[PDB]
Design a protein around this ligand. Structure first.
Ligand SMILES: CCCCCCCCCCCC(=O)OC[C@H](COP(=O)(O)OCC[N+](C)(C)C)OC(=O)CCCCCCCCCCC
Ligand SMILES: CCCCCCCCCCCC(=O)OC[C@H](COP(=O)(O)OCC[N+](C)(C)C)OC(=O)CCCCCCCCCCC
Ligand SMILES: CCCCCCCCCCCC(=O)OC[C@H](COP(=O)(O)OCC[N+](C)(C)C)OC(=O)CCCCCCCCCCC
Ligand SMILES: CCCCCCCCCCCC(=O)OC[C@H](COP(=O)(O)OCC[N+](C)(C)C)OC(=O)CCCCCCCCCCC
Ligand SMILES: CCCCCCCCCCCC(=O)OC[C@H](COP(=O)(O)OCC[N+](C)(C)C)OC(=O)CCCCCCCCCCC
Ligand SMILES: FC(F)O[C@@H](F)C(F)(F)F
Ligand SMILES: FC(F)O[C@@H](F)C(F)(F)F
Ligand SMILES: FC(F)O[C@@H](F)C(F)(F)F
Ligand SMILES: FC(F)O[C@@H](F)C(F)(F)F
Ligand SMILES: FC(F)O[C@@H](F)C(F)(F)F
Lengths: 311, 311, 311, 311, 311
């Protein structure tokens, strides 16, 4: 067992195909996903040619160890894939048709900029390193790239599973490597973030704003501080489900902006009380009256500015 | 070792049967469960037939490697099942009776719409891909589908373990695939949600409503805000034990609706105080008196509307 | 290698023995425990008998693959046990003495009714399936059932490790199955629950009762609500360390009952203030005075009733 | 391959040695640690003895399967160790020098009594079970017991890695067993507990004591209750990182004692207010004045008593 | 298969090189990281040399088992690396060129002193133990040390992957051990700590300082205590994501220092009220006025002192 030799001096083409069966565990924090799929491989090995007449059988079946099989590996995996050889069929000409079912944890970075309204392009990079006797090249057999209809990935929508037909051939450690890019396009199902995080966060903020219709400092201090604590809780909850990004996320921006609102409202509440004690409730009253409009207006404007910057 | 050949040109029938031994780890968030069961396979291989009289042995036992065994795989699994071959028995007519005990982590989506009063149909999909020499078809031997009496799945009730007799036969990557659907029907034991989540959540809400029998703004602000924080806690606790759904759940709806109640009660408490400071306690008094009835009534009506929509 | 044939037509007795080495990870939520023990198997295989004299050896040693060894499996395990064959000894009469050291994750349900003052009976079910040529039966060699003195199971006391001598024989998928029940009797070390959960929970409740010696509504609302939140925290902490039971637990009952106390105390606090505002502090004063005795009395009575029902 | 036979009727001495390479994951809750070390085994097998002059070679090499190797196992492990045979060298007299590198998860109970100022003695128990032909005995080759300089165990100090030279020889299931005790002495790096848990816990308690310099019941109720909630948080945080002990820990004692302080302070704060409302501020004033001294004094005395009992 | 013998009496040089493919899971608490890379080994084995003319091939391919391959191990790993042999090529002069792709969990301590503004040097220690026939020594083939462009480590910046050319040779259990140090230089992406932890922590502290512009003790007690609770939350959140260090961290210092600020502010708040009740608001007023400047000034100075000490 060693590579099939060239007729002329051409490189060996291994036709590939990935057919998704299962998609699960898209971990945001880890930027990983688990995949269970069929990996199909085809190449001509003339050494394996046979006469169906002389051997009875139209197609021969081989055990992995019996024949030369190309060393196909995934680039962006945690550990080497768990594979089970489903079948190895050889036609009389020596054309090998290899099928395996595999499972792997794929490392694919995510762009959290538009979270939870983001979409992603997951990658599965197939690779072959060239042997000494001959160069091995990868190719996509589009007939063998797909996914089953039941492929669901919890809390995401699957747009497309396609392969970039042209491999990336390059040198690595004094040998040629032929790499293919399989692309899984998905979009996050943002629905649940609305009643679980967005609306509750807004409600608590709006409740803080009731202090603009109160002259009671002690009640205001309670209203603003208490809701700020509930906001910290939401911030912590949100940040625990996301990885630490070197960029500002849409969600991150909003969450942060809201802190400034609580801070300014505390200042207002402090100012209003200070003036009242200092026997000038007229100034205080006009500040409070302005705030009642300013706060919602500035909040609504700021959000428009943000959504614009982010989308 | 290669498939047994057809007498005429009929497909090979593999008689299947799953007998559950253990059911555990139904993870709601992951939408997975662990299973430990017997997998029974039975097909005819004439090449294995023998004389009952001349052999003197009623049945013959083989080692997996000695004979051709169909490649049965599960569709909705995380990784390929962990199997141990228990026994392989061949009768004189060449009927093969294979038995293995396996363990696997099954991927089966759940409908959270009626949580925690929901019922589910877990699936275990058995599959076989046809070979070049012949088409392999799956069949259910109802005599070999079951579960042991002790099979308990913590916090769930096991209604039935049945198999859809008619396999789904279809082409996949230029070969035939025979797929069977094993169904585990279960219903959630909702009992514990009542004293742990439902009642405490109602209690805290009812406690907020005591502010309708108080003229103290500062005490009211404390009553409503404090309980709202306890509600956020329950919401977080509930949402951490559930996956992110693209649909509204019964629980989710209730939890959300309750936020509106806390918000409106804050408005009322603000309104009542505002009118008191503005020297008109008569208007305030009639608003508070109305609220005392409105709040429970609207709450009770809203819940009826919801339960109707959901059940 | 195939089963030893019967002298008459008797079944094959496999003498068993489990000797515990390690006991760890009793997971309450999962209702599992890990075990590391010796498994001893002994049966007669005449085909291996020898003359001690012409051999010049009292005992013969074998490698697993060399001889027929019964397929013993555990019923209530997550995955098939991890075993290492320690030693296989053959006496002149063909008596085989097999020893292996194994590790396994055992599924054994727990009765949470008396938690944290509960005791449990963990099970380890040994099984063997009968073959075509003969019926394989299990037996307990009491000389080979035990545990080492150092076997400790964190936060539990080990009472006894015994085996039910008479195996449960039954047909499962047209073959007789012989099952043995090994029983590990344990009792929970309740000590720590007293200073960590019980007493703190009582302290916070008693602190709520100080509102019966206060006329300040605003301070009372703070006392009762604040402690109720600390109670919710204890409830959450307790419920996270336990599985969801379809029955009421002793702890569960107490925890729940206490909610009613906080609810009623809120009502009292509301009533007392309402009467004070309504210019009738005499009625309020006698209600508060009654509560001061009622609350502790009813609490103490309720607990007596509960402990009775549960123990 | 079978044991080397005795010259006289002496037992087989297997000289052992453990050389630590890595120490990690000391889990307090689990009472486990992970270890990566060299395991060295040496014994005389005369059958292997050769001539140094004629053979030309002064040392002869073997593959595990080629020769008899004693079955050494660890007692206090979760699962059987992961080992890689490094080398097997045989000297002219038949002395075998076996070396393997292994990794294992060790089960070793901890004494939480002095936490976080505790020290521990971790154990690694080596064992050998005697065979039918001969008795196997373990011995410590002190030249082969050690640890590398870089062996660090996060948040612990490594004092010593020594072996108790005299093995524990005893009967187990009608055979002899020889057991060695390897001891890893460590002491907890308590530093971080001071600014993260100790001081914050004291600060919140001292803040509660400011109510002894306040006549405002409503402010006092807030001071004492709020800090008690922060104490419950610290208690929960501390108890989640420790296993459930049947004994009282130093930390446990302090944490609990502090609850009594919050309870008594609540009583004081209630008493002071009650007397004030009852128009006798002189009695109240002298109670508060006494408390100002009593509380710190009793706290300081109680801690001295505790530290004494525990250290 | 045994080591290539020395021409003179020189040690065997094994030329190494690690080429990183994947970098993930830098766990701060565990002080571990996962790595997926190519391991390249090259040594001369003259017993394998050949004439390119007679053989008619300029290279020779071998299966691992066919030839002698040095036992290279990693020092700082949890368990032995998961490796797949990619290729083994022999040149005419008997120069062996080995390549494997491996995955491992590396134990590399981190210096938390400057967190979250820290940089780290991760280590990968390659080792070889010399055999009886000869001494093995490791060397770096700089042409074969690298990383691919896509190598990203979430929340960290990869500065350099270099190897210390000169191995650390030493005696370990009477044999020579040659050790190489591969160094991965990284710097933490501190960005996210600013809007998620730093700023919110400052905001809550600044909000506490509004009590210096209030005469309301009850409102002040609420402001300072409530924010102190939010600070405890941040402290807990921060400490859960870090290991327990025997040294003070920059973050740790700040977090702790801030507690003193809350404590002193409580004292001030208590003093101011005490003076007011004692009918001397003039002294109280000047203390409060001083605090308004003192607090921010001392805070700003203290931070300057700290940043200096730490950077
Ligand atoms: C709290 C502050 C309010 C946050 C709401 C942000 C919604 C948003 O702005 O999200 C916008 C996204 C759509 O973005 P997209 O389809 O990926 O657009 C990508 C293509 N181009 C042209 C924009 C580049 O949401 C939705 O379709 C529904 C949002 C409902 C949210 C209701 C509340
Ligand atoms: C907080 C608001 C109250 C929530 C209570 C909802 C109960 C409910 O509405 O649940 C209804 C479920 C029964 O639903 P089902 O048997 O699956 O009906 C499916 C079939 N058809 C005709 C409805 C479609 O509960 C119970 O049997 C007991 C509920 C006790 C809850 C006590 C509180
Ligand atoms: C908060 C409310 C108080 C809860 C305390 C319940 C204690 C209890 O009632 O527990 C009772 C258990 C004993 O139960 P047993 O030995 O299993 O009895 C089983 C046999 N027969 C006859 C009862 C059936 O506790 C103890 O020995 C010590 C309990 C100390 C708790 C101190 C507080
Ligand atoms: C909150 C209440 C205060 C708790 C502080 C307890 C400190 C202690 O008491 O700890 C004592 C331990 C030393 O104990 P050891 O070296 O193991 O003594 C074992 C040997 N003989 C004779 C005692 C038996 O701490 C220290 O060296 C430094 C403790 C600094 C804590 C500063 C706060
Ligand atoms: C809350 C208190 C404020 C904490 C802010 C500390 C920032 C700091 O002091 O960090 C300093 C680090 C740079 O340190 P370095 O590049 O590793 O310097 C190592 C080399 N020599 C000469 C110092 C030794 O941050 C930054 O470049 C940006 C920090 C922005 C923080 C904004 C808030
Ligand atoms: F700010 C919101 F739009 O985004 C967040 F708050 C999140 F994550 F969705 F909860
Ligand atoms: F019924 C709703 F309130 O949902 C809650 F009860 C739940 F989910 F069960 F905890
Ligand atoms: F109810 C009592 F038994 O105590 C419980 F609440 C406990 F111990 F926390 F589980
Ligand atoms: F009480 C002291 F021993 O410290 C404890 F509170 C601790 F370390 F925080 F757990
Ligand atoms: F405050 C600085 F010390 O850094 C802190 F904010 C941190 F690490 F982010 F928690």
């Amino acid at each position: 067992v060693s590579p099939p030799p060239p007729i002329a001096d051409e490189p060996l083409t291994v036709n590939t195909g990935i057919y998704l069966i299962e998609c699960y565990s898209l971990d945001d924090k880890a930027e990983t996903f688990k995949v269970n799929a069929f990996l199909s491989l085809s190449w001509k090995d003339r050494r394996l040619a046979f006469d169906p007449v002389r051997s009875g059988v139209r197609v021969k079946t081989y055990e992995p160890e019996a024949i030369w099989i190309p060393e196909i590996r995934f680039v962006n995996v945690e550990n080497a894939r768990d594979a089970d050889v489903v079948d190895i069929s050889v036609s009389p000409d020596g054309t090998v048709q290899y099928l395996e079912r595999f499972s792997a944890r794929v490392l694919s970075p995510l762009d959290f900029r538009r979270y939870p309204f983001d979409s992603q392009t997951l990658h599965i990079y197939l690779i072959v390193r060239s042997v000494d006797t001959r160069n091995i090249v990868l190719a996509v057999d589009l007939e063998k790239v797909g996914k089953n209809d039941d492929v669901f990935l919890t809390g995401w929508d699957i747009e497309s599973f396609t392969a970039v037909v042209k491999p990336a051939n390059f040198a690595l450690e004094d040998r040629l490597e032929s790499k293919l890019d399989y692309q899984l396009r998905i979009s996050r199902q943002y629905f649940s973030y609305i009643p679980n995080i967005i609306l509750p966060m807004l409600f608590i903020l709006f409740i803080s704003w009731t202090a603009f219709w109160s002259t009671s400092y002690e009640a205001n201090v309670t209203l603003v501080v208490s809701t700020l604590i509930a906001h910290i809780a939401f911030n912590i909850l949100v940040e625990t489900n996301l990885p630490k990004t070197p960029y500002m996320t849409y969600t991150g921006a909003i969450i942060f902006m809201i802190y400034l609102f609580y801070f300014v409202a505390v200042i207002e509440v402090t100012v209003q009380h200070y003036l009242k004690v200092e026997s000038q409730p007229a100034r205080a009253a006009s500040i409070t009256r302005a705030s009642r409009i300013a706060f919602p207006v500035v909040f609504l404007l700021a959000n428009i500015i943000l959504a614009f910057l982010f989308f």
